Amino acid sequence: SQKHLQINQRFEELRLITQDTENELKKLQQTQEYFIIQYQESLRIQAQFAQLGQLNPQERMSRETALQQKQVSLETWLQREAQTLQQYRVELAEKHQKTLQLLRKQQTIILDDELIQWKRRQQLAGNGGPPEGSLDVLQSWCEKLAEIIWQNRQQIRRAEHLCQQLPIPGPVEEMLAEVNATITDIISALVTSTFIIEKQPPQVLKTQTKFAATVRLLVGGKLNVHMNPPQVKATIISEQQAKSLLKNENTRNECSGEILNNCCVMEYHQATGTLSAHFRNMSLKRESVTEEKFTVLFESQFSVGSNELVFQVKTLSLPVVVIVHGSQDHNATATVLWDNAFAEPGRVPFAVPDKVLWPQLCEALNMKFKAEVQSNRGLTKENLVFLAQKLFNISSNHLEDYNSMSVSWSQFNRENLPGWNYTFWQWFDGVMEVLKKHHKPHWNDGAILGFVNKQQAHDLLINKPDGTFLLRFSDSEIGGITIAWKFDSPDRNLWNLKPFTTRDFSIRSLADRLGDLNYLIYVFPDRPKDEVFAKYYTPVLAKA
Amino acid sequence: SQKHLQINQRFEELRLITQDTENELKKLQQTQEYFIIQYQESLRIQAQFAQLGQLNPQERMSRETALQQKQVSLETWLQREAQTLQQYRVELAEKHQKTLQLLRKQQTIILDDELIQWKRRQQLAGNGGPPEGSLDVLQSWCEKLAEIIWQNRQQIRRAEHLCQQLPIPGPVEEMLAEVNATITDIISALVTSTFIIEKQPPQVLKTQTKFAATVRLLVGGKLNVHMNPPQVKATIISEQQAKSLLKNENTRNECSGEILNNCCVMEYHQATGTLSAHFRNMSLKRESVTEEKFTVLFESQFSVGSNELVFQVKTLSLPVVVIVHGSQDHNATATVLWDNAFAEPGRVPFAVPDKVLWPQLCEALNMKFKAEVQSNRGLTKENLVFLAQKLFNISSNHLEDYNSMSVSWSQFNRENLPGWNYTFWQWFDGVMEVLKKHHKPHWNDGAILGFVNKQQAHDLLINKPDGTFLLRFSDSEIGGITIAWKFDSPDRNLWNLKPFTTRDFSIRSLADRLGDLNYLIYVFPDRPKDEVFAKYYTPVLAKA
């Protein structure tokens, strides 16, 4: 790693720049401490004038002398060191000005690039993108950040203590107040933005279903919150409300969503430093219902340090679709897909696009596809087209054509496809559903060609040996696969039988179904049937 | 170490007893969490009765059935587990009852024996007793204590959270409130009694003199105070007032002593865990003055943990004698001596004895003597007697006689000794003073016999060779040594010359003074002069 082993320096600079500011602070405080006993040694040999009243002749005239002379030297040191004391003080305040600037840099890079990114990594994991990865790498980052910021805090707080104990009419009250002004901005940043959802709630949940979330606070380790673990409170909130929550005009109470059976205590795992909070059993109650976005809000409150600073952290869950149904996991699961894929960075809670360029839908589709069917046999160059053709209802036969096209939400899952009484997503969903339902092996196995129309089925087979067939996703019927084969006295309606859905496949399996049919001789490319299915045929204590 | 490597177990028991109470706590909270979703599964299949209103014929009569049956079983589990939940709850409360009892034991041993003892070790160090030793061994103790008490704190605080979230009319509110009642008593103990003076202020100080103290808080390491270091405020207070401060009837403000130039911020040394506070430059202002005890009070305030508990620690300095003088370090230094030696454990601030049995004054005298003259040539059996005879003004010639005698303060430093116009302490003081002033080497060296009266001088020498002499502490004169020798035409007033004090020994040294006199031939026991002083004669670029 390069860009990471860059912040490991930006840190150890911060370490040493921080490690010398209290090296100044300390001696600059020896200064004060000494200067103060001089201020006083002065006052001492001064009220010594008011006490020369016990006065011999020559000698207590002539010690007015040694006294006045010891002042002339003192008041000189005292005046001379006053400006030493003011200067050093300024030096050190603009030294903080400096360490902070670099710290605001690190903070920014950590929080706005690193975390934002691990966050989207998660978001895309929603549509079965690659796993976020362990938070551990960022925590180290953040506690390292919290450690070095919180020092510099107690550092200028000692500086206060000094200046507020020996006033020095100067530019210092400002610099101090300005420097103390930015260090509080840098903490609220740190604290709030590090209160994050580790394990995200189920994106499509149904009323009364046990689900979980794990929220953690990365800084909780260092600046000391573990000391008495705060309660984090879950509360389900509408999209409309998440908008109101952000531009802080609430009535911090309402929650277009209503109660859910869990709201738990945080818990520190010593020797990981992870201040987790696992909600391992929550529950729900209370232009469509299927397009209704809700978000689970996680709020917690607590004080940092011995006490002074006290915060209320808030964090919104990725969006969620609540379904009181039989099941339309399917329609919701789209509005979720589209949200996870296309969310703009910092969109005001649930601002999704309305249209999207085909090749971006493509990588969403593909990602969810592979994740769902659990193969890395993705939607190949051709596959993407079969789709583009289906979705767009146009002939254009090679992909790069669509690069500039645009799909509305409504052309994805509002408008039903030309032939049919289902949407594009409906179709594509039913594909992933039957596939991951019965035919998972058969996919990376290669057995089900799938993304082909009656015509392509017709061409790819006509000149092939007798019994050559393929498996094709039936637009024919609501989520199935038709078997098209070819035997020689065929037709322009050449041999293909009517679709099998999940029903058929439960009552009896495809591999078996294929194995009973004699005309079906080998699976498209050339390879014989037994070969590609005999693994999956069902036996008994049976015969020849 | 045996009695110490006993608490290292009593600790690791506490560790494991504590380490399993949250093992119960945790599962006893899985229980609750589950039981709660059952309470709810019950309510679920209950409002299912109010919703059978969509009711076919036979089948929604005959599902009133499966419903009532699913309750009969639920309500049974629910009743049955409620008592499981109540019982475990009690088990764990009386399990804390248990860990705390053992912890109150450890605490007690640590604080009241160990610390009290290291404390007296220090107090006696006042009279030059052996050094306290490093606090480090006790801190480990105390943070180990603070660590294991503070867990058990967050532990029952989780128990609250549970019972205060699922009420259970029972014996538990008590046990919890009783158990929580003792754990707060055990902390105030811990916090307050571990705020201690590491380096004690100078026991006899004069107005406007730079002095220092170091106060530390042993728990500051673990339970988290370092997080923003508190200010500790020094304030000089009378004996009279220390009495009022204890039986809390102050007007927390007054201080029969008045200001002193210092009041500083605490400071954590990471990787020692020591939360020190060094006052490395304070300063004083404002039936005798020489018997006036004052104490330096150190007070500090702060909150432990995230915040909840907040304390004000107080700690009193060993007593102090303020002198606005030329110098009577001497009289003060006695009233300090007698205070450090004889202080009863837990005396209401400055309750000193009035009389004391000789042999205990003896070990005080001896201790200070060796410390002061910096030799481990102590007051020998005989020496102690020479004194006892001097102090008591009686003939009794061997020590064990005095074992039962008693010396009043007034017979120590009020009544002047029979012959003289000085007290007993005055004498003994001036002995240590000239000794550590000029003759430190000569003491362990053996050169000055010292604790002998004119008569003993007379006997020990009469039959010795011509020029045999000794050095004898002159009651003769205010803080000196007379040289008694013997030459053969002598007298019953046999050869001894008048005392030399500090004056004489400055203007010219004893060794030199002895080396000029020819009649002085060898130093008592037998050994020749040059032998025992030629080390210490003064040269020049001189001759034969």
3-class DSSP string for A176-188? HHHHHHHHHHHHH
Distance, in Å, from the CA atom of A399 to the CA atom of A365, rounded to the nearest integer, reads 15
Q: Which one, of B131, B126, B282, lies nearest residue B204 by Cα?
A: B126
A263 φ, ψ (degrees, to nearest 5) = -170, 100
Distance, in Å, from the CA atom of A201 to the CA atom of A195, rounded to the nearest integer, reads 15
Task: State the helix-helix crossing angle for B329-342 and B116-125, rounded to 10 degrees.
Answer: 150
In this complex, do A40 and B305 lie within 8 Å of one another by their Cβ atoms? Answer: no
* Domains of chain B: residue spans and CATH: 1-195 (1.20.1050.20), 196-325 (2.60.40.630), 326-447 (1.10.238.10), 448-534 (3.30.505.10)
Owner of token pair 């860059």: A6
Cα of B163 to nearest chain A Cα, Å? 13
The three-state secondary structure class of B211 is strand
Contact B90, B171 (CB under 8 A): yes
Sign of the torsion angle spanned by Cα atoms A163, B228, B313, B337: negative
A280 interface with B at CB cutoff 8 Å: yes
Contact B176, B159 (CB under 8 A): yes
Residue numbers of B between 34 and 63 with CB closer than 8 Å to A: 34, 36-37, 40, 44
Cα of B45 to nearest chain A Cα, Å? 12
Owner of token pair 């894929």: A341
What one-letter code names the amino acid at B455?
Q
Give the technique used to solve this structure: X-ray
Distance, in Å, from the CA atom of A319 to the CA atom of A156, rounded to the nearest integer, reads 42
Listed resolution, Å: 3.2
CA distances from A233 to A69, A263, A296, A312 (A): 72, 5, 10, 11
Contacts of residue B7, defined as CB under 8 A and 6 or more positions apart, other chains included, come to B106, B109, B110, B141
A318 by Cβ neighbours in 10 Å (0-12 / 13-18 / 19+) ranks as buried
For the CA atoms of A418, A423, A429, A431, the dihedral, rounded to the nearest 10 degrees, stands at: -20
B302 interface with A at CB cutoff 8 Å: yes
Cα of A392 to nearest chain B Cα, Å? 44
Contacts of B46 in chain A (CB under 8 A): none
- Provide the pairing of β-strand A496-500 with A294-303: unpaired
Cα angle B332, B335, B338 (rounded to 5 degrees) comes to: 145
A64 interface with B at CB cutoff 8 Å: no
Contact A297, A215 (CB under 8 A): no
Give the count of beta carbons closer than 10 Å to the beta carbon of residue B491.
Answer: 8
Beta-carbon-side half-sphere exposure of residue B283 (alpha carbons within 13 Å): 16
Contact B498, B412 (CB under 8 A): no
Contacts of residue B72, defined as CB under 8 A and 6 or more positions apart, other chains included, come to none
The three-state secondary structure class of B316 is strand
Which segments of A374-417 does DSSP mark as H helices, in order? 381-392, 409-413
CA distances from B143 to A293, B210, B221, B302 (A): 51, 33, 7, 17
Task: State the helix-helix crossing angle for A381-392 and A424-438, rounded to 10 degrees.
Answer: 140
What one-letter code names the amino acid at A150?
W
Which secondary-structure segment (H or E) carries A72?
helix A62-108
Quick one: tokens of B492?
Answer: 């019953």
Distance, in Å, from the CA atom of A420 to the CA atom of A430, rounded to the nearest integer, reads 14
Task: State the helix-helix crossing angle for B424-438 and B329-342, rounded to 10 degrees.
Answer: 100
Distance, in Å, from the CA atom of A375 to the CA atom of B327, rounded to the nearest integer, reads 95
Reduced DSSP (H G I as helix, E B as strand, rest coil) percent helix, strand, coil of chain B, to 5: 50, 15, 35
Q: Give me the residue from A154, A158, A307 closest to B307, CB to CB.
A: A307
Contacts of residue B259, defined as CB under 8 A and 6 or more positions apart, other chains included, come to B285, B286
Contacts of B307 in chain A (CB under 8 A): 303, 306-307
Number of helices (H) and strands (E) in chain A: give both, helices first: 16, 15
Contact A375, A446 (CB under 8 A): no
Looking at the DSSP assignment, which residues form a beta bridge with residue A196? Answer: A216
In this complex, do B154 and A228 lie within 8 Å of one another by their Cβ atoms? Answer: yes
What one-letter code names the amino acid at A330?
H
What one-letter code names the amino acid at A76?
T
Give the count of beta carbons closer than 10 Å to the beta carbon of residue B538.
Answer: 10
Contact A147, A61 (CB under 8 A): no
What are the E-state strand segments in A3-92?
none
Q: Give me the residue from B161, B228, B308 closest to A154, CB to CB.
A: B228
Contact B438, B512 (CB under 8 A): no
Distance, in Å, from the CA atom of A134 to the CA atom of A138, rounded to the nearest integer, reads 8
A285 interface with B at CB cutoff 8 Å: no
Contacts of residue B235, defined as CB under 8 A and 6 or more positions apart, other chains included, come to B255, B257, B260, B263, B296, B297, B298, B299
Give the count of beta carbons closer than 10 Å to the beta carbon of residue B76.
Answer: 10
What one-letter code names the amino acid at A401?
D
Distance, in Å, from the CA atom of A480 to the CA atom of A460, rounded to the nearest integer, reads 20
Distance, in Å, from the CA atom of B29 to the CA atom of B16, rounded to the nearest integer, reads 20
CA distances from A368 to A340, A363, B452, B505 (A): 11, 9, 106, 101
Sign of the torsion angle spanned by Cα atoms A336, A342, A347, A352: negative
Reduced DSSP (H G I as helix, E B as strand, rest coil) percent helix, strand, coil of chain A, to 5: 50, 15, 35
Contact B282, B260 (CB under 8 A): yes
Give which of A27, A306, A311, A313 to mutate to test B binding, by max B Cβ within 10 Å.
Answer: A306
Quick one: tokens of B518?
Answer: 């020819």
Cα nearest neighbour of B222 on chain A: A227
Sign of the torsion angle spanned by Cα atoms B339, B345, B350, B355: negative
Cα nearest neighbour of A228 on chain B: B306
Owner of token pair 């490319």: A525
For the CA atoms of B401, B407, B413, B418, the dihedral, rounded to the nearest 10 degrees, stands at: -50
Distance, in Å, from the CA atom of A270 to the CA atom of A273, rounded to the nearest integer, reads 5
CA distances from B498 to A403, B286, B456, B480, B491 (A): 121, 43, 17, 9, 16
Q: Give me the residue from B225, B281, B306 closest to A37, CB to CB.
A: B281
Quick one: tokens of B348?
Answer: 């209401």
Contact B412, B424 (CB under 8 A): yes
The three-state secondary structure class of A498 is strand
What are the E-state strand segments in B116-207?
195-199, 204-205
In this complex, do A265 and B158 lie within 8 Å of one another by their Cβ atoms? Answer: yes
DSSP-assigned states of every residue in A189-249: HHHHHTEEEEEPP-SEE-SS--EEEEEEESTTTTTT-TTSPPBEEEEEEEHHHHHHHHTT-
Contact B341, B360 (CB under 8 A): yes
A301 φ, ψ (degrees, to nearest 5) = -140, 155
In this complex, do A306 and B302 lie within 8 Å of one another by their Cβ atoms? Answer: yes
Q: How far is CA A311 from the centre of its chain?
A: 21
Contact A275, A220 (CB under 8 A): yes
The three-state secondary structure class of A482 is strand
A210 interface with B at CB cutoff 8 Å: yes
Contact A483, A469 (CB under 8 A): yes
**DSSP state, residue A289:** G
Residues A182-212 as b or e (16 or more Cβ within 10 Å = b) = ebeebbebbbbbbbbbbebbbbbbbeeeebe
Q: Which one, of A174, A10, A186, lies nearest residue A93 by Cα?
A: A174
Cα nearest neighbour of B160 on chain A: A265
Distance, in Å, from the CA atom of A405 to the CA atom of A413, rounded to the nearest integer, reads 17
Contacts of A34 in chain B (CB under 8 A): 281
Contacts of B231 in chain A (CB under 8 A): 161
The three-state secondary structure class of A49 is coil
Number of helices (H) and strands (E) in chain B: give both, helices first: 16, 14
Distance, in Å, from the CA atom of B377 to the CA atom of A276, rounded to the nearest integer, reads 66
B228 interface with A at CB cutoff 8 Å: yes
Looking at the DSSP assignment, which residues form a beta bridge with residue A312? Answer: A301
**DSSP state, residue A109:** I
The three-state secondary structure class of A297 is strand
Owner of token pair 């919104």: A316
Q: Which one, of A194, A211, A263, lies nearest residue A232 by Cα?
A: A263
Distance, in Å, from the CA atom of A376 to the CA atom of A369, rounded to the nearest integer, reads 9
Span between the terminal Cα atoms of chain B, in Å: 61
Distance, in Å, from the CA atom of A422 to the CA atom of A444, rounded to the nearest integer, reads 27
DSSP-assigned states of every residue in B52-110: TTS--SSTTTTTHHHHHHHHHHHHHHHHHHHHHHHHHHHHHHHHHHHHHHHHHHHHHII
Contacts of A261 in chain B (CB under 8 A): 36-37, 40
CA distances from A158 to A175, B213, B262 (A): 14, 20, 15
Contact A104, A182 (CB under 8 A): yes
In this complex, do B280 and A210 lie within 8 Å of one another by their Cβ atoms? Answer: no
A229 interface with B at CB cutoff 8 Å: yes
Q: How far is CA B226 from the centre of its chain?
A: 23
Cα angle A17, A20, A24 (rounded to 5 degrees) comes to: 135
Beta-carbon-side half-sphere exposure of residue A449 (alpha carbons within 13 Å): 23
Q: How many residues does chain B have?
A: 544
Task: State the helix-helix crossing angle for B7-44 and B136-163, rounded to 10 degrees.
Answer: 20
- Provide the pairing of β-strand A355-357 with A406-408: antiparallel
Give the count of beta carbons closer than 10 Å to the beta carbon of residue B198.
Answer: 17
Contact B219, B190 (CB under 8 A): yes
What one-letter code names the amino acid at A438?
H
Cα of A174 to nearest chain B Cα, Å? 23
DSSP-assigned states of every residue in A405-465: -EEEHHHHHTSBPTTSSSBHHHHHHHHHHHHHHH-HHHHHHT---BS--HHHHHHHHHTS-
Q: What are the contacts of B111-115 at 24+ separation with CB within 8 A?
A: B111/B189, B111/B190, B111/B193, B111/B194, B114/B138, B114/B141, B115/B193, B115/B194, B115/B196
Residues A81-116 as b or e (16 or more Cβ within 10 Å = b) = beeebbebbbebbebbeebbebbbebbebbbeebbe
Distance, in Å, from the CA atom of A390 to the CA atom of A417, rounded to the nearest integer, reads 8
Distance, in Å, from the CA atom of B209 to the CA atom of B200, rounded to the nearest integer, reads 15
A537 interface with B at CB cutoff 8 Å: no
Which segments of B374-470 does DSSP mark as H helices, in order? 381-392, 409-413, 424-438, 440-445, 454-462
